[PDB]
Amino acid sequence: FLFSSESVCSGHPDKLCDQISDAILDACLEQDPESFVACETCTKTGFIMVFGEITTKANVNYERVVRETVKEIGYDSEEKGLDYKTMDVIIKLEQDIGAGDQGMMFGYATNETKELMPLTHVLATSITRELDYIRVKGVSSRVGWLRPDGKAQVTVEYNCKHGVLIPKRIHTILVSVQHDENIENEEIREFVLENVIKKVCPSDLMDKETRILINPSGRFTIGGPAADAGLTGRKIIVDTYGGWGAHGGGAFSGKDATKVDRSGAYMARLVAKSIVFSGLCSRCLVQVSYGIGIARPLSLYINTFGTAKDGYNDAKLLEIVNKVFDFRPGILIKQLNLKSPIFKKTSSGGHFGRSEEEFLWEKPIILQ
């Protein structure tokens, strides 16, 4: 079968909101590691609004954080879809441990890739992260024509043998990249193919029939918030596993670590990755469920899709996980260092499959 995943650039209006929500979270954490933050952002023509609840001892200039985050992402002109200098900023923020809410969270891993992530998502997010890296770090004489909005989608043809996923070929790569009026389509295409697609997509999975589409619906000068509304938590599948596995519905950005929607998902990722990395299966889905005010999870579930190593079964894996891993929120927070202001980096490019040293949920443990 064919399977597709999407990623979006840091300048996509929804991801802009996630990044602002987490920039505010980090700003609070830098001064008060005990901050509680539930920060939502939305955006459209000429404005950003930040709303929700914060309990902090930190003294943070919320508007200044918003405007600086938008500046760093590159929205410095109305022509691009938003200007940090001219936009309106609306601030409506209200100023044995149990979970802070109910909810379920899933973690997933697969040995398809070195990241232990599904290949479609690895590739789409590699494309968008590379575009953002080039835009922000390349010389303006070469790359100044790039604007912040964009997305990529990758369709892979799979074979599925006894639960094991074997990519056969890359079927389609779709890239949308916002740009200024002065660059012609041919140059856009050549730049993206040579400096992005061929840099991150393995040539051994491409062939002459691979469909490569770059701004296929026409030029893309009009973008950002002026072109499309954005909101925090509207890219939760981009943020996690790209359509694979399952999702409990909870968004990550703008939430401090006492929100199990984030910390429980991070821990479930650590567990599934550890099971797969230890060679006990090829693919693993973990579901953890909490109840408000209750420290131990109401439930835990493991599915290896029939790929468990001979000698192991999903029930034995759960027994092991219960011996090794602790899902009580206070322990998750301490073990994963979730009071550190590390979260802005998670809010674009996917929360999982990431190689930064500060993402402890991606450092697997050996299980036996």
Active site (catalytic) residues: 12, 14-15, 40, 53, 151, 220, 228-229, 234-235, 255, 259, 261
Q: Exactly one of 236, 238, 270, 336 binds K ion (CB under 5 A); which one?
A: 236
| Whole-number Å distance between alpha carbons of 76 and 181 | 16
Contact 254, 39 (CB under 8 A): yes
| Residue from 51, 79, 330, 354 binding a second copy (CB under 8 A) | 51
Among residues 52, 50, 37, which one has the least CA distance to residue 89? 50
Nearer to Mg ion, 101 or 326 (CB): 101
CA distance 315 to 290: 20
Residues 26, 271: Cα–Cα separation, whole Å: 25
Is residue 218 annotated as involved in ligand binding? no
- Give the tokens for residue 201: 């997509």
Q: 182 vs 203, which CB is nearer to Mg ion?
A: 182
Q: Residue 156 Cβ, how far from a second copy at the closest point, in Å? A: 9
Q: Give whichever of 233 and 254 is closer to K ion, judged by the CB atom.
A: 233
Least Å distance, CB 331 to a second copy, is 19
Residue with tokens 């999982």: 352
- SS3 assignment, position 237: coil
**Candidate ranges 66-74, 96-104, 181-189, 264-272; the one touching a second copy (CB under 8 A):** 96-104
Identity (one letter) of the amino acid at 192? V
Nearest to 81 by CA among 218, 206, 179: 179
**Shorter beta-carbon distance to K ion: residue 120 or 232:** 232
Residue 360 CB, shortest distance to a second copy, in Å, is 10
101 annotated ligand binder: yes
Please work out, in degrees rounded to the nearest 5, the angle formed at the alpha carbon of residue 170 by the alpha carbons of 172 and 14. 55
Residues 91-120, one symbol each (x = binds Cl ion by CB under 5 A, - = not), give ------------------------------
140's enclosing H/E stretch is helix 140-143
For residue 135, what are its two tokens?
């835009």
CA angle 31, 36, 41 (to 5 degrees): 95
Query: Closest approach of Cβ 44 to Mg ion, in Å?
Result: 8
According to the annotation, is 228 in a ligand binding site?
yes
Could you say which residues in the range 243-262 bind Cl ion, by CB under 5 A? 250-251
Q: Would you give the distance in Å from CA 151 to the centre of its chain? A: 13
Please work out, in degrees rounded to the nearest 5, the angle formed at the alpha carbon of residue 17 by the alpha carbons of 12 and 21.
Answer: 145
As measured in angstroms, the least distance from the Cβ of 250 to K ion is 8
Task: Map residues 205-234 to x or -, x wherever contact with K ion holds by CB under 5 A.
Answer: ----------------------------xx
Is residue 261 part of an annotated ligand binding site? yes
Contact region with a second copy (CB under 8 A), list: 58-66, 75-83, 151-159, 262-270: 151-159
Q: Are 35 and 223 in contact (CB under 8 A)?
A: no
Q: Does the annotation list 204 as a binding residue? A: no
What phi and psi, each to the nearest 5 degrees, are found at residue 91? -115, 115
CB of 249 to Cl ion, least distance (A): 7
Q: What is the binding site for Mg ion (CB under 5 A)?
A: 14, 101, 144, 228-229, 234
Q: Which amino acid belongs to residue 63?
A: E
Instruction: Confirm whether residue 256 is marked as ligand binding.
Output: no
Instruction: With H, G, I as helix, E, B as strand and everything else as coil, classify residue 365.
Output: coil
Amino acid at 242: G
Residue 8 binds K ion, judged by CB under 5 A: no
Q: Which helix (H) or strand (E) holds 160?
A: strand 146-161
98 CB burial (10 A radius; 0-12, 13-18, 19+): middle
Q: Which is nearer to Mg ion, 62 or 290 (CB)?
A: 290
Selection from Cl ion, Mg ion, K ion, none that 149 binds (CB < 5 to 8 A by kind) is none
Using the contact rule CB under 8 A, the part of the chain among 61-69, 268-276, 293-301, 328-336 near a second copy is 293-301
Binding site for K ion (CB under 5 A): 233-234, 236
Binding residues for Mg(2+): 14, 40, 101, 144, 228-229, 261
Binding site for Cl ion (CB under 5 A): 250-251
Binding residues: 14, 40, 101, 144, 228-229, 261
